[PDB]
Amino acid sequence: MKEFYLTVEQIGDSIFERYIDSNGRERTREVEYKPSLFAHCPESQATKYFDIYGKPCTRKLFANMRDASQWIKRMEDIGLEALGMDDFKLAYLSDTYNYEIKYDHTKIRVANFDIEVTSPDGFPEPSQAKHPIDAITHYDSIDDRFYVFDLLNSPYGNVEEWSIEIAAKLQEQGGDEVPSEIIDKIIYMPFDNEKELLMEYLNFWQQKTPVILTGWNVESFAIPYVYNRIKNIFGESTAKRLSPHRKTRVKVIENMYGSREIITLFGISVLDYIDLYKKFSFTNQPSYSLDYISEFELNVGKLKYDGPISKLRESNHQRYISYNIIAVYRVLQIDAKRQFINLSLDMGYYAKIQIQSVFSPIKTWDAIIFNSLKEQNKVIPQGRSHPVQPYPGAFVKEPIPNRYKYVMSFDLTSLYPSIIRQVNISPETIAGTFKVAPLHDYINAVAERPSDVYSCSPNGMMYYKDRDGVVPTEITKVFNQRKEHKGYMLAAQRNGEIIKEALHNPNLSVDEPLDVDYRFDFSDEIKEKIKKLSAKSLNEMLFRAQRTEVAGMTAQINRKLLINSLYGALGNVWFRYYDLRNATAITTFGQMALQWIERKVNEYLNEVCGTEGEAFVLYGDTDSIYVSADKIIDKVGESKFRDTNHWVDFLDKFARERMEPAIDRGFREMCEYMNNKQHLMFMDREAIAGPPLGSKGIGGFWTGKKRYALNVWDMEGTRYAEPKLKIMGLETQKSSTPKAVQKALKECIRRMLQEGEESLQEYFKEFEKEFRQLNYISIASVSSANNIAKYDVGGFPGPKCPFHIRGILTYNRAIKGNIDAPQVVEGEKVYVLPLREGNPFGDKCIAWPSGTEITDLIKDDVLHWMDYTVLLEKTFIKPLEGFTSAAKLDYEKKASLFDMFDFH
DNA sequence: CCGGTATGACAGCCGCG
DNA sequence: GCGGCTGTCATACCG
């Protein structure tokens, strides 16, 4: 097997590596690595090393890393450039592994653990770690076992041993519903005192030292609590043993608001699943607690207990231990579904970085490019501490707030990556500049042609058409690998079809699955002697065909993620290949591309419909245009179509045959006008919107920029049997909007587009009467709690104090003295409720932590004073007028027509 | 260490017989 | 004060 790294660290003049060797064993080694940095040299001096600009460089080899970094410092103090990879870990990875890394996850120790800490005085702060750790459940991926460490005696109670018999029983049989899947995998270890527990867990830690450390909030709680607990009882030297290299660092992470501290454990890659979820899930959640995310992903019911957390070990220790195990297991079930760990491994090895760096698009691309350039014997440029200034961005069209019956959308393919390739945008390819005219003049093509020899962007940038740019080449590569892994996935899909027919007529003798590649599809030379084989062997040849089929998509997804993350990296000042003018070029071209095609789509549709000057494109956002298909329908009449599906077919056929080539011809003209290297503005039909045929619905409406709703029938050649609502930017798609309200507004939107005015009025009328019977959680708004102390003046709302903050300061007055009550942590989101005049609180709102039921100390009175009428107006009625006034509909039986004009 | 533009809510300011 | 208008802040969205 091929050798691969696990963790990599720099300590002083030696790098510390953990790795799997040629025999599958986990090994560690200190290396006094000899790095190589690069300086500018005269022409006459010959080497094979050149920078990205094609300028000669001399490889300067250092004895140790101290000397290397001391030299960079000296180059700064005078005004010269120090070329090469300054991050010596990365340069080491590339040297030890100068080939395509193929990893085996089975050999990688992935640990996820969760601790329990009984704390009667509120949340147990990890910095102090003053309370005994009374439970640790530690799962090891290699062992496939759960290791349970259970404290039996503490200041907070003497408890009996946890029973694995009871833990298996049904909820109505004695509690604890630990699944059969993991019951055989639990290893239970009770302890007489805390010192024995921590010491045994630290010995356990030495034996099964995690390479990847995961869990929920593990970096902000579990790690720093365990480390500080051991440090305070035993000492720093004992606590530092959590690092296999015996080195730890206390790191202070600071946001734009607030500050906290984490512990770095050199020799361990920490992938907190909360951070892993937040980055890769691509959906904002009202709460980021484990129980809420588990509910979302796994559909698993509420993990319920009796009383508060701080009294659960004392009252039901059996349930206390079981809920610590399930908590670990939930993170395991989520990973089984989303694969965010395998993905972060697959991306990390591909780029040849340390796995924690995949949280940073910067570090990843910095290494992928570094790897390719290293083969070319090319030298990477120096990082320059560029200042921060926001460059211009995407174009968004202002839409007329109206109803729109029929809409066809058209989206461009990977717009920004495509722009980079089309114009050849890269640091070294910057050819020159030209005097620019207003963007409009380029959109309308009246301004003189920018250049006869160079590839151009509307911001005044010129790029060589003959050079192959470092950035564009590298993104073409990833684009090609994505394209190549279709030739592996679909190739297995061709082979997966003739298995059910192969097993339909088999002949058994000897199980002989001959070695033939699944990535490259089978030919008639192999297909002839593969169907007459054994019946039992066909199952294994299908099992490995499915293995390759998923593996093809797994790598394919990682390429798209890499594609989509490039632009953001190029726009980041801390990026090695960052250039202000280049990022401006990517974006301004996009501004042109969208408006250019808008101008072309209108001109084309005017010619075919006979009219002149009418606006067919209603809305355009970044890479997508929206076209009103009203006149196209009216051209053949609505009553001529039999069913809904018959007019969806018509617009689909029209887009395909008539509109696509018009779009295609328009962009080719733009490529020539700009003198670009390659035409890559491919725009294909996205969505087809409209009401049911013979119905009083409106089909779609806009209220403003980034706020619209459509009734979709087809999305890229896929016909929905039942129509889907594509709501974008409206309240129903916002995390702030209450749950019951969220669904009721969506239903109002559904009744608008599909059923008409009369139906909307009927639903709204009744949702008034039974509004008060709905759950109080489903009618509370959600907001992030930031800068609470900034507006806090002795527990009182200060100058310019927000509404959600005003609720937290009413909450603090309500929990006055009670250290048992749940706390509002800054950064964490909170539920918001309004309460009427005459309330026994002070202000007019109250806010409690999100994802939880409000405490019994105030639920007695809050569920009594909360103003529904104000809540009905603020969260439901006001947003509804937003929709209805824009759609030209009325939600209420009789409204005056005059109450729409601004008047005197 | 991946620009654009919406709504809610507050506070300054101007003219308000 | 009572609305209107506008700058600001905070939050959360669209690509």
PDB file of N, CA and C in Angstrom, chain A residues 838-868:
ATOM      1  N   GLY A 838     -48.793  47.009  30.160  1.00  0.00           N
ATOM      2  CA  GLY A 838     -49.264  46.585  31.480  1.00  0.00           C
ATOM      3  C   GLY A 838     -48.576  45.327  31.978  1.00  0.00           C
ATOM      4  N   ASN A 839     -47.543  44.907  31.248  1.00  0.00           N
ATOM      5  CA  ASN A 839     -46.768  43.702  31.552  1.00  0.00           C
ATOM      6  C   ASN A 839     -45.963  43.801  32.855  1.00  0.00           C
ATOM      7  N   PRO A 840     -45.766  42.661  33.551  1.00  0.00           N
ATOM      8  CA  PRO A 840     -44.975  42.655  34.775  1.00  0.00           C
ATOM      9  C   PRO A 840     -43.504  42.319  34.501  1.00  0.00           C
ATOM     10  N   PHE A 841     -42.874  43.102  33.628  1.00  0.00           N
ATOM     11  CA  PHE A 841     -41.471  42.903  33.263  1.00  0.00           C
ATOM     12  C   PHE A 841     -40.701  44.220  33.186  1.00  0.00           C
ATOM     13  N   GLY A 842     -41.208  45.150  32.378  1.00  0.00           N
ATOM     14  CA  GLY A 842     -40.579  46.456  32.196  1.00  0.00           C
ATOM     15  C   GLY A 842     -40.715  46.970  30.776  1.00  0.00           C
ATOM     16  N   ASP A 843     -40.124  46.243  29.833  1.00  0.00           N
ATOM     17  CA  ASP A 843     -40.194  46.600  28.417  1.00  0.00           C
ATOM     18  C   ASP A 843     -41.352  45.885  27.719  1.00  0.00           C
ATOM     19  N   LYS A 844     -41.338  45.882  26.388  1.00  0.00           N
ATOM     20  CA  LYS A 844     -42.441  45.317  25.605  1.00  0.00           C
ATOM     21  C   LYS A 844     -42.103  44.023  24.846  1.00  0.00           C
ATOM     22  N   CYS A 845     -40.955  43.429  25.165  1.00  0.00           N
ATOM     23  CA  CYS A 845     -40.582  42.119  24.628  1.00  0.00           C
ATOM     24  C   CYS A 845     -39.703  41.304  25.580  1.00  0.00           C
ATOM     25  N   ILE A 846     -39.712  39.987  25.379  1.00  0.00           N
ATOM     26  CA  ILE A 846     -38.878  39.057  26.139  1.00  0.00           C
ATOM     27  C   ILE A 846     -38.218  38.044  25.196  1.00  0.00           C
ATOM     28  N   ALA A 847     -36.953  37.722  25.459  1.00  0.00           N
ATOM     29  CA  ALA A 847     -36.201  36.805  24.603  1.00  0.00           C
ATOM     30  C   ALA A 847     -35.502  35.704  25.390  1.00  0.00           C
ATOM     31  N   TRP A 848     -35.711  34.459  24.966  1.00  0.00           N
ATOM     32  CA  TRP A 848     -35.067  33.303  25.592  1.00  0.00           C
ATOM     33  C   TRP A 848     -34.315  32.470  24.577  1.00  0.00           C
ATOM     34  N   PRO A 849     -33.304  31.691  25.029  1.00  0.00           N
ATOM     35  CA  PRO A 849     -32.454  30.909  24.122  1.00  0.00           C
ATOM     36  C   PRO A 849     -33.236  30.048  23.133  1.00  0.00           C
ATOM     37  N   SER A 850     -32.792  30.051  21.878  1.00  0.00           N
ATOM     38  CA  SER A 850     -33.464  29.310  20.812  1.00  0.00           C
ATOM     39  C   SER A 850     -33.264  27.800  20.938  1.00  0.00           C
ATOM     40  N   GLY A 851     -34.184  27.045  20.341  1.00  0.00           N
ATOM     41  CA  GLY A 851     -34.144  25.584  20.348  1.00  0.00           C
ATOM     42  C   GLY A 851     -34.601  24.936  21.643  1.00  0.00           C
ATOM     43  N   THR A 852     -35.113  25.744  22.571  1.00  0.00           N
ATOM     44  CA  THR A 852     -35.519  25.252  23.891  1.00  0.00           C
ATOM     45  C   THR A 852     -36.872  25.798  24.349  1.00  0.00           C
ATOM     46  N   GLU A 853     -37.547  25.021  25.196  1.00  0.00           N
ATOM     47  CA  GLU A 853     -38.736  25.471  25.914  1.00  0.00           C
ATOM     48  C   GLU A 853     -38.321  26.494  26.965  1.00  0.00           C
ATOM     49  N   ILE A 854     -39.106  27.561  27.103  1.00  0.00           N
ATOM     50  CA  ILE A 854     -38.822  28.614  28.087  1.00  0.00           C
ATOM     51  C   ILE A 854     -39.010  28.089  29.516  1.00  0.00           C
ATOM     52  N   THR A 855     -38.163  28.557  30.433  1.00  0.00           N
ATOM     53  CA  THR A 855     -38.137  28.064  31.818  1.00  0.00           C
ATOM     54  C   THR A 855     -39.455  28.286  32.578  1.00  0.00           C
ATOM     55  N   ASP A 856     -39.753  27.368  33.501  1.00  0.00           N
ATOM     56  CA  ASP A 856     -40.998  27.380  34.281  1.00  0.00           C
ATOM     57  C   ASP A 856     -41.104  28.566  35.244  1.00  0.00           C
ATOM     58  N   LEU A 857     -39.980  29.245  35.459  1.00  0.00           N
ATOM     59  CA  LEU A 857     -39.913  30.421  36.325  1.00  0.00           C
ATOM     60  C   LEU A 857     -40.659  31.620  35.731  1.00  0.00           C
ATOM     61  N   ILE A 858     -40.798  31.638  34.403  1.00  0.00           N
ATOM     62  CA  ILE A 858     -41.468  32.739  33.695  1.00  0.00           C
ATOM     63  C   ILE A 858     -42.552  32.301  32.696  1.00  0.00           C
ATOM     64  N   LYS A 859     -42.588  31.008  32.370  1.00  0.00           N
ATOM     65  CA  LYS A 859     -43.616  30.444  31.482  1.00  0.00           C
ATOM     66  C   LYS A 859     -45.033  30.582  32.065  1.00  0.00           C
ATOM     67  N   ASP A 860     -45.117  30.716  33.390  1.00  0.00           N
ATOM     68  CA  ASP A 860     -46.382  30.953  34.090  1.00  0.00           C
ATOM     69  C   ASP A 860     -47.033  32.275  33.668  1.00  0.00           C
ATOM     70  N   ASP A 861     -46.208  33.307  33.488  1.00  0.00           N
ATOM     71  CA  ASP A 861     -46.688  34.658  33.175  1.00  0.00           C
ATOM     72  C   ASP A 861     -46.518  35.080  31.709  1.00  0.00           C
ATOM     73  N   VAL A 862     -45.438  34.630  31.067  1.00  0.00           N
ATOM     74  CA  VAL A 862     -45.169  34.955  29.654  1.00  0.00           C
ATOM     75  C   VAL A 862     -46.284  34.446  28.734  1.00  0.00           C
ATOM     76  N   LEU A 863     -46.712  33.206  28.959  1.00  0.00           N
ATOM     77  CA  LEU A 863     -47.801  32.590  28.199  1.00  0.00           C
ATOM     78  C   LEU A 863     -49.164  33.193  28.587  1.00  0.00           C
ATOM     79  N   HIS A 864     -49.140  34.430  29.080  1.00  0.00           N
ATOM     80  CA  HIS A 864     -50.339  35.124  29.535  1.00  0.00           C
ATOM     81  C   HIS A 864     -50.356  36.558  29.079  1.00  0.00           C
ATOM     82  N   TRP A 865     -49.184  37.194  29.062  1.00  0.00           N
ATOM     83  CA  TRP A 865     -49.063  38.615  28.712  1.00  0.00           C
ATOM     84  C   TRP A 865     -48.686  38.877  27.276  1.00  0.00           C
ATOM     85  N   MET A 866     -48.217  37.845  26.575  1.00  0.00           N
ATOM     86  CA  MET A 866     -47.780  37.996  25.183  1.00  0.00           C
ATOM     87  C   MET A 866     -48.912  38.478  24.275  1.00  0.00           C
ATOM     88  N   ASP A 867     -48.649  39.557  23.540  1.00  0.00           N
ATOM     89  CA  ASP A 867     -49.658  40.162  22.676  1.00  0.00           C
ATOM     90  C   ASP A 867     -49.709  39.454  21.328  1.00  0.00           C
ATOM     91  N   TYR A 868     -50.804  38.737  21.092  1.00  0.00           N
ATOM     92  CA  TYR A 868     -51.013  38.019  19.840  1.00  0.00           C
ATOM     93  C   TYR A 868     -51.338  38.970  18.692  1.00  0.00           C
TER      94      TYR A 868
END
